[model samples]
Target: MTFVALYDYVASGETDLSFKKGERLQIVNNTEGDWWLAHSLTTGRTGYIPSNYVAPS
Candidate 1:
């Protein structure tokens, strides 16, 4: 699934992904609930991103 960032986020952990608002992300896994594994289309990086920070695009 594709999603667009709703707010900028700074990665707090090694597995977390940082992203800017308006960036596009591809969801890799969503079974984690509050955090989902996503690949950042803008940065070409894969990591966990906060679920609330993005909306389905």
Candidate 2:
């Protein structure tokens, strides 16, 4: 496990209720390391988020 943690901040396109920012999220997959397949640890709703679009804490 990469570790589940808060977004630390929010993003523009993550307005969907399927998930939320600053919420603990899991990195489902990351092939290139530039983009990632992620999901909410709370909702399990998954999506792709940019590598730079996260809190690397």
Candidate 3:
């Protein structure tokens, strides 16, 4: 897997999507910056997430 979900996160912004802990997120784009783009496996939602929230699996 490219990336793994660290913990459950709630959206603080409109574009953000909520995810549960251990939920696998499809790697979309960005990682160098503070935030990263990803796809929610369970919700099928795409949005940006804090880079620190995930890590290599």
Candidate 4:
């Protein structure tokens, strides 16, 4: 995909905010415009997030 939902929490009613700690996302690697179709990497699902979300070392 090319975009994701990026919700707020694990619940269904959870607000769709920007992002939070431990929250999964659908990043594009600052170049790869990708996303999750199952809403896992955004709304409810998990995995395949952006590089920015990756913790810095």
Candidate 5:
């Protein structure tokens, strides 16, 4: 079984209580070797994480 770590970043605090896999989130920073567009799932709240960290099963 695979498990995904939920981001406990200080910036992501006090925001959405839950984040489902395959959810769209805005890319706050540009990553290397990535060819996908990051989006904001907070619907305007500023919270960005790498796509690789989104691997959930």
Candidate 6:
């Protein structure tokens, strides 16, 4: 599944992927609580992101 970022996020952790608002992401995994593993379409980076920051696209 894919998702679009709802707001800009500056990653604060090593595993977090920073993204800009409106960026599209492909979900790699969503089993983690609060955070989900995703691949950023904009940067080709894979990392964790806050689930609440993105919405299904």
What is the full ranking by lDDT, best candidate first?
Answer: 6, 1, 3, 2, 5, 4
List, residue by residue over 1-57, the lDDT tens digit for candidate 4.
334333332334332224455544443334444322223343454343333333322
Cα deviation at 53, candidate 4, in Å, is 5.5
Output the worst ten-in-a-row residue range by lDDT, candidate 4: 8-17
Ranking by TM-score: 6, 1, 3, 2, 5, 4
Model 1: runs farther than 4 Å from truth?
Answer: none
**Model 1: ten consecutive residues of lowest lDDT:** 27-36
Q: Give the alpha-carbon lDDT of every model.
A: 0.95, 0.57, 0.80, 0.37, 0.42, 0.96
**Candidate 6 per-residue C-alpha lDDT over 1-57 given as tens digits, one digit per residue, 9 for 90 to 100:** 999999999999899999999999999999759999999999999999999999999
Question: How many times do residue backbones clash in model 5?
Answer: 3
Model 4 residue 11 CA deviation in Å? 20
Which has the higher lDDT value, candidate number 2 or candidate number 5? Answer: 2
Model 2 misplaced stretches (Cα beyond 4 Å): 2-19
Q: What are the RMSD figures for all models against the true structure?
A: 0.8, 4.2, 1.6, 8.6, 7.6, 0.7
lDDT for predicted candidate 1 compared with the true structure: 0.95
Top candidate on lDDT is: 6
Angstrom error at residue 33, model 2: 4.2
TM-score, candidate 1, is 0.94
Tens digits of per-residue lDDT for model 1, 1-57: 999999999999899999999999999999758989999999999999999999989
Residue 31's lDDT within candidate 6 is 72
lDDT of 3 by residue, 1-57 (tens): 467789878889987767877887887888477778889787788998877778886
Q: Count the clashes in each prediction.
A: 0, 1, 0, 3, 3, 0
lDDT of 4: 0.37
Per-residue CA lDDT of model 5 for 1-57, tens digit only, reads: 232324532334443223455444554445564322344454444444444555443
> What lDDT is reached at residue 45 by model 1?
99
Q: Which candidate leads in TM-score?
A: 6
